[PDB]
Design a protein around this ligand. Sequence first.
Ligand SMILES: Cc1cc2nc3c(=O)[nH]c(=O)nc-3n(C[C@H](O)[C@H](O)[C@H](O)COP(=O)(O)OP(=O)(O)OC[C@H]3O[C@@H](n4cnc5c(N)ncnc54)[C@H](O)[C@@H]3O)c2cc1C
Ligand SMILES: Cc1cc2nc3c(=O)[nH]c(=O)nc-3n(C[C@H](O)[C@H](O)[C@H](O)COP(=O)(O)OP(=O)(O)OC[C@H]3O[C@@H](n4cnc5c(N)ncnc54)[C@H](O)[C@@H]3O)c2cc1C
Ligand SMILES: Cc1cc2nc3c(=O)[nH]c(=O)nc-3n(C[C@H](O)[C@H](O)[C@H](O)COP(=O)(O)OP(=O)(O)OC[C@H]3O[C@@H](n4cnc5c(N)ncnc54)[C@H](O)[C@@H]3O)c2cc1C
Ligand SMILES: Cc1cc2nc3c(=O)[nH]c(=O)nc-3n(C[C@H](O)[C@H](O)[C@H](O)COP(=O)(O)OP(=O)(O)OC[C@H]3O[C@@H](n4cnc5c(N)ncnc54)[C@H](O)[C@@H]3O)c2cc1C
Ligand SMILES: NCCC[C@H](N)C(=O)O
Ligand SMILES: NCCC[C@H](N)C(=O)O
Ligand SMILES: NCCC[C@H](N)C(=O)O
Ligand SMILES: NCCC[C@H](N)C(=O)O
Lengths: 448, 448, 448, 448
Amino acid sequence: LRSTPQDELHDLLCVGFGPASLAIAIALHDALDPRLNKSAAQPKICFLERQKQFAWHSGMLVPGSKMQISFIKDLATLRDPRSSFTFLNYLHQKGRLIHFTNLSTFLPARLEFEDYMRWCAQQFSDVVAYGEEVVEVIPGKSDPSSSVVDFFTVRSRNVETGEISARRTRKVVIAIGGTAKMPSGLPQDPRIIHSSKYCTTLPALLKDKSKPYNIAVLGSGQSAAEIFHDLQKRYPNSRTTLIMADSAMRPSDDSPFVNEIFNPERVDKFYSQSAAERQRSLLADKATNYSVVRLELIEEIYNDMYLQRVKNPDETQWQHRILPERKITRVEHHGPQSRMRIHLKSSKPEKETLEVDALMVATGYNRNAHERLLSKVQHLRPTGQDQWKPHRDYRVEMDPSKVSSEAGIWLQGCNERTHGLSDSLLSVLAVRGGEMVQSIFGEQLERA
Amino acid sequence: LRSTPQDELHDLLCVGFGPASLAIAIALHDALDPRLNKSAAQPKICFLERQKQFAWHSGMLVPGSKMQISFIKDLATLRDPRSSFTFLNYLHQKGRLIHFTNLSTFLPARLEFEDYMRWCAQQFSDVVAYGEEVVEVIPGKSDPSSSVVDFFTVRSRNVETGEISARRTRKVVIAIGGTAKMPSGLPQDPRIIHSSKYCTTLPALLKDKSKPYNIAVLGSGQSAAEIFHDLQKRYPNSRTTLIMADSAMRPSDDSPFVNEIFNPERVDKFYSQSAAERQRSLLADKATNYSVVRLELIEEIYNDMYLQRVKNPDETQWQHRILPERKITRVEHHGPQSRMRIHLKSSKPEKETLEVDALMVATGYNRNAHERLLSKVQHLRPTGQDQWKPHRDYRVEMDPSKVSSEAGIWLQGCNERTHGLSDSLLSVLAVRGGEMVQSIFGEQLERA
Amino acid sequence: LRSTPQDELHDLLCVGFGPASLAIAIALHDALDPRLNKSAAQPKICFLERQKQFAWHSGMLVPGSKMQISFIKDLATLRDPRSSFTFLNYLHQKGRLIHFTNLSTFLPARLEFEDYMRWCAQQFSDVVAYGEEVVEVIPGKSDPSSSVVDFFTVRSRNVETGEISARRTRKVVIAIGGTAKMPSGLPQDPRIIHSSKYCTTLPALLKDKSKPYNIAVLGSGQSAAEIFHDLQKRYPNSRTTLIMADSAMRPSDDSPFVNEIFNPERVDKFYSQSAAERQRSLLADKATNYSVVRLELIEEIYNDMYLQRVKNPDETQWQHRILPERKITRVEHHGPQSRMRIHLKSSKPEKETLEVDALMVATGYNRNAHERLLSKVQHLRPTGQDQWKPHRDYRVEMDPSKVSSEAGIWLQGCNERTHGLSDSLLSVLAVRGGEMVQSIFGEQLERA
Amino acid sequence: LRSTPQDELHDLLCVGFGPASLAIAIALHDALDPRLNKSAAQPKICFLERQKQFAWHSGMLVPGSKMQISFIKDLATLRDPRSSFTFLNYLHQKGRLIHFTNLSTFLPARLEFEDYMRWCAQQFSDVVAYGEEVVEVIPGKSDPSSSVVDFFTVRSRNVETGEISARRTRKVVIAIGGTAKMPSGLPQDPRIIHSSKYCTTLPALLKDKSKPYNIAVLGSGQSAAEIFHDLQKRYPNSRTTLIMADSAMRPSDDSPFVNEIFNPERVDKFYSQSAAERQRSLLADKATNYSVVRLELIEEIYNDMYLQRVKNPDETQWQHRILPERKITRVEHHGPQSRMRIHLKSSKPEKETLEVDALMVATGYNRNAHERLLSKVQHLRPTGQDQWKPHRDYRVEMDPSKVSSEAGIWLQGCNERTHGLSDSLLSVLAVRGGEMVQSIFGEQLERA
Ligand SMILES: Cc1cc2nc3c(=O)[nH]c(=O)nc-3n(C[C@H](O)[C@H](O)[C@H](O)COP(=O)(O)OP(=O)(O)OC[C@H]3O[C@@H](n4cnc5c(N)ncnc54)[C@H](O)[C@@H]3O)c2cc1C
Ligand SMILES: Cc1cc2nc3c(=O)[nH]c(=O)nc-3n(C[C@H](O)[C@H](O)[C@H](O)COP(=O)(O)OP(=O)(O)OC[C@H]3O[C@@H](n4cnc5c(N)ncnc54)[C@H](O)[C@@H]3O)c2cc1C
Ligand SMILES: Cc1cc2nc3c(=O)[nH]c(=O)nc-3n(C[C@H](O)[C@H](O)[C@H](O)COP(=O)(O)OP(=O)(O)OC[C@H]3O[C@@H](n4cnc5c(N)ncnc54)[C@H](O)[C@@H]3O)c2cc1C
Ligand SMILES: Cc1cc2nc3c(=O)[nH]c(=O)nc-3n(C[C@H](O)[C@H](O)[C@H](O)COP(=O)(O)OP(=O)(O)OC[C@H]3O[C@@H](n4cnc5c(N)ncnc54)[C@H](O)[C@@H]3O)c2cc1C
Ligand SMILES: NCCC[C@H](N)C(=O)O
Ligand SMILES: NCCC[C@H](N)C(=O)O
Ligand SMILES: NCCC[C@H](N)C(=O)O
Ligand SMILES: NCCC[C@H](N)C(=O)O
């Protein structure tokens, strides 16, 4: 793809260049490839990404961590296995395909899958501006005296220089993933760190890997379990504690019938249901992604706890402990020592104390950051509508009398409520990328 | 154990001789064994069982069916691994121990585990009366002019002769398992058969194993899946249909932390919680036993469905089908043909038709049959109490002013509400058997 | 690919259209595809196949049988994952890709993998002549008065009409797989049938699937185990016996380091070794393909034998039996009854009798059938050479003074001795197909 | 068991108190237990052990190492599952039985299985003399003027004081396991260490766990693989190299039919075969114990090597490497540096250099140490017999005219040649212990 000068009106501007945006780029490439599409002037496109280079959840690239989905659900295969952007073609290009085959696994290390996506991302370097944090989307009128919006201005702050840049586009995609969700009862402290900053910020706080630190982990999902388990290897002499409201770590449901809810074709079926039925369906399949741990990891942690029991039958003396059915009621963190004092009580409706050097908080993400960006375009929604309403094709509903048919805003990754549990995942990216290219560039590609 | 004449006052009478009663017999044997118990006149005991010989859920002894619990949770091992009644000692006695070891499985065929329990049961033939269906428990007073009950009369109907027999005892155990639960909307028909009568009554209805029968299965739990899968082998030319209200077969949770709720020592912890907390706990762990299927079986059924897809991409033509999110709204069964007409609708709140030769109904069991038996002893409960309240030791609460301290009634297998999800299972039988012997015969065994 | 008239001089004629020839066709297609090869007059090519339509070992398409290699080692992927002929693209074309992904298996049913190859094969119908059994390859001289051979005539017998057809070509490939190997001590009898004719000819002999037949299986490899296991399902009332010289069924070695001997790049390394070192290497890795059984199948058969032990401790009474360390010394088959009398002795160097309705013989294949076809071209080998010597590129050595550089004969599938254990398998077909196209059509493709 | 004074004539003296001797002690206890044996003066018995307390291969108690046999093949279960010395009863005594059950594994950590055997061993402390290294067995005659031997004197050296003690016994068992086998081409050096001294002596040589040591491992069996893998965790910055003569690590054969060669009842069958047939049988099943690695460990090492490939495609740069088909031809170890210089060549019949801080040598064991101990009793063998010939019951053949029927010597653990591959393992210890008690104490126990 060829670059577009900053000053030109773009056909599409995409906010964020994580997997969701990358899947769109790939799908656009493939749609424009005569070897893949018998139909195939390039669209004027640009991706803005706040990170300085492509990275996928680098704060959680835990040593040994594995993908939780088959490599077949990569960024292209489910749309077109002939694509140059498949995982298998990536491996072939790296001279590693036969070697991977001998592993007999569908689940690559997260490190390898990141490198796959990095390899994909590098092929779009001409159309991605890195180090650009988007701060706002503003409506624009090519005829300022009219009452019709027909473009948007996207403003971004250079992360290095702090300078503001503006780019104009007919169409916008917001694909910015999630922001760290923190419990509202915990105070702000450098020793209290969200899971997303685990690999990034914890080593800077706890510099000496040999020291007998006390480290707590709050949560019971995949991130909590991965951190809990990794801390035992990273800090071999540390005393770790897993704090959870639930009675137990629970396994992720990847059984084949249940798992079909992640099929690309099931988005149609989910989207068509009423608000009530969609709400009920999300709760019925909560065990497939939310606050759950991959079985193999649960078993590994359980085995480690058993080995501690072999060495010492007194659980209170174990180096590493799990404290179930607990909630944090108070955090003392103004004292003269390195350690905070965490007060615990029963998570049951109507206990002990921990002293820790750090508290890792694995409480998931919020996916409402698009709201702050779209603040100035809110008035273009149908009268009295106080929430963004994405259509099946991910384009938000706007007042047809206020916005031209050629102008629009699409949301990606934040649409679980309307599109299902696969929305925030990698599960349907390849197919969704294809659908997005058709939605956004359909008229243009139809001409050829 | 030596037999007691019918006319003598017994120390204990046990109603039922399934696994729960058998575990008590075994525990009593072990308590009276000087090789196992350094402490050790035999108690006057009798077991009444309606079946003509020992059998364990013989209507569901499906070819190839496996246990869903480790053989270590047999009828003795968790109480005393030295017991002659362990699974491993059974195998050693049969000359099969080394051969079983080479299987490297914790999960024996149900056929083998039944034979194990049969081998155990045969050693108590002197104290078990088979072919005796208990019909009522009646209070008795050794001083009829007093207001104090100090014994019970247990009346049973001989299944062959229909004759009524009475036996008197100080203490009663009711361990009678469950009765077939049928949906209240289905009419009575020989072609509508509960899962518990699958192996017993279906072959008599559908005699020719080669015929192209249409057979429906209602349900989504283990029994439904086992029947659905077995029907495809038993009737190779049949057209089978699995009808379920849920969207999918869901896997049983046997992950190690969750599974600890089945530990014998956790009964104390569960029992001590309030009514509210126990109710919440039962629902939190519903995925461990209720309306769930062993993963290996789900995968096998899924693979079979995939193979049908390979042969024919049109699901409506498949020999064997699953119809999820469906409820039966009407059954036509008065027509001139062999087949009933089953009308289906969506299980969603505010469809097709099946013609079938048989409907197998796998909707679980009720565990309230003790109520009918205890009807005449109800007046001995504390005033205004309209439900049986078992203590931790399984003895029901009675008015101390109306019932002697030497007289009592115990319940087994029907106490999930107070004792947890393991209550109706094999999970805690060995330990519970030990506890029951202490509760019932404690004073007697304390003397020696 | 476009067809060539029978009378024209061909660039290549391939004898056989099994996987090995199909891999060449696919590789040629891909080499001529401008979307895959930036380089790309079509070569005049024809494939002759004795079967009336594409089929892959249909006599052993046992119900439930699985592939013994990852689907990644299909007919294209290891050469180019972008190819339209990959397994994943086949699944995508059939609308089954997402469904296969949910199986989480690398091992498709043999039935599905056959259909994949059939789907591939159908795209070459213009260049394949079915029902043509090649009977001889004859040298030809465009100048008959010269001493230089520069073409070959390939003669084939129409399987339906018996008519002989001749086609001329510069280059020949022989890719005809193997022929049934039978022990030299067994007499010819309709009741004695090679494993390759199991699904084809056994049902015709033993027509009634309900009858209590006695059926023996000779052998201890994959085919023997698959037949032994299948016979128990196909003939539910039959008495089956597995006769083997070895003490036990042994598992195939698919462990990752060992398995690297099947890597495409290892052919170079194997080929370069001396005759002595190649001989030693073949024997060192015998456990990877020869007289071995997939572990999962061994365990399944073992479990079945254990279940028989549960029902009856007396092995002599078992419906299905394995007789290890046995050899057949005599077969009585002239008697007045339906059954043959098989005499057995110990396989040890210096026993019982079986009466059977059929003996299935699973003793592998011979790969020397090219010899009979190449009989009249033998004189073109270097003087005094009495065996065909394939180069690394599979072209047999010929006397440069007797044969033109544009004429040649290639062998495929029969080269284990020089090229390694992967030669007769699917393991390296995709890469080898690519190498073959370069060897055969190199000069032609170099021009473009 | 009660102790016997040193000066008294013993009924049995056992040299060594590893698993094999411990199994005899346990079997004797059980034979004398009235709860287990209806038959049951205690025999005068003593065990001499060179280690200061019970330990099982403590130089190879690698962190995370697992048993390679089912816990059912413990020191008692296969003989009598009712025994107090079973693994399950040990777990019950430690309050760990339910917790172990939830692991759903047949394979305990080596650490746990050692503790089990330690728990067993401690119950025989009265009859075991620790810190006693046996140096010789001498014939004795109660009538010195006669030509009949009727006792043996066993002399041992106190490991602490160096003092020699003599004990007299009618019967001797030698159960001393194996001694480190070193290749004859390697020179003696503190930096060259056998696998048996891995956990004991390597940390003393390489004290700083953070240092970038170069460490080589010679061998391709279980010990080599365990050391190779452990070194990567123990010395995180080390450069490790696995040197092996074979082309690849090969998996242990634990498939169920093959594995039956380890059945206790198969000893009879093996022993009865001729010398030739026994030799052939040992080689046929070499893949079950000799120079083989547990599959799970091979896969784990392979995955680690794959991860190195992901990070760097150049194998020569990998931190950890495997060098197959290599033999050591020279070791330079007189140089002024900390590192030895290891010269390698191809292991093929008719290369590089490594500089290493330590060479771990995992080349198995010799089992001929009984020869040195029995030197002075050799003359009691039948004339012209130059090797010890154990009967089926493990008693060595002696000249009936030179040795009384009440005197004898038994061998344990060194009898693979006559008794099969299970001889040196834990596989048949429980049953063999039972057989040994009958052989040794038969007459005595028959009286009661
Ligand atoms: C530890 C972990 C493991 C996971 N593993 C799996 C798995 O195995 N399988 C699976 O299917 N899913 C997994 N996920 C779920 C995950 O949400 C998806 O894999 C994927 O990251 C979603 O892609 P996205 O592009 O929607 O969001 P993201 O990956 O978060 O990408 C959003 C991008 O937008 C950028 N951005 C944000 N705000 C701005 C702004 N204002 N201006 C410019 N750029 C901005 C961010 O820097 C980021 O690069 C995992 C998640 C976590 C946290
Ligand atoms: C198909 C199936 C598979 C199962 N598999 C497992 C498993 O793998 N693991 C597990 O832990 N649990 C399993 N269970 C759960 C099961 O409830 C327990 O295994 C066990 O049967 C409970 O024993 P019980 O004695 O309480 O009840 P039951 O086994 O039902 O025994 C009750 C006995 O009382 C007799 N009886 C009833 N009424 C009378 C009367 N009026 N007079 C005299 N006698 C009477 C009955 O004939 C019966 O013999 C399974 C259940 C089913 C249906
Ligand atoms: C039961 C079974 C299962 C197997 N499964 C696997 C597996 O899972 N993995 C694996 O890698 N390998 C497997 N194989 C090994 C097998 O050899 C290869 O998969 C593959 O069949 C080799 O292809 P080929 O074309 O060399 O030989 P073939 O497949 O035998 O093809 C040869 C073709 O030439 C035709 N032909 C023969 N003679 C003539 C003639 N005179 N004129 C014209 N046409 C002729 C034949 O009809 C046939 O179509 C299996 C083999 C068997 C028997
Ligand atoms: C790393 C490793 C792992 C293994 N794991 C398994 C497994 O999982 N499964 C399995 O079945 N087998 C395993 N084995 C095989 C092993 O040989 C047996 O498990 C077992 O140790 C054999 O017991 P033993 O008593 O015959 O020999 P040992 O265990 O060697 O016991 C011999 C004892 O005699 C003592 N001794 C020696 N010489 C003298 C003397 N002169 N005087 C006095 N005392 C002496 C020694 O100190 C020692 O305590 C393993 C072996 C190794 C090396
Ligand atoms: N944690 C991601 C879950 C994805 C789902 N199991 C799938 O197969 O798509
Ligand atoms: N279906 C019976 C469940 C029993 C439970 N998994 C246990 O381990 O006890
Ligand atoms: N039976 C075919 C063996 C093929 C080999 N396991 C491979 O991976 O190529
Ligand atoms: N490495 C010990 C092998 C023991 C054998 N697999 C057995 O089951 O006895």
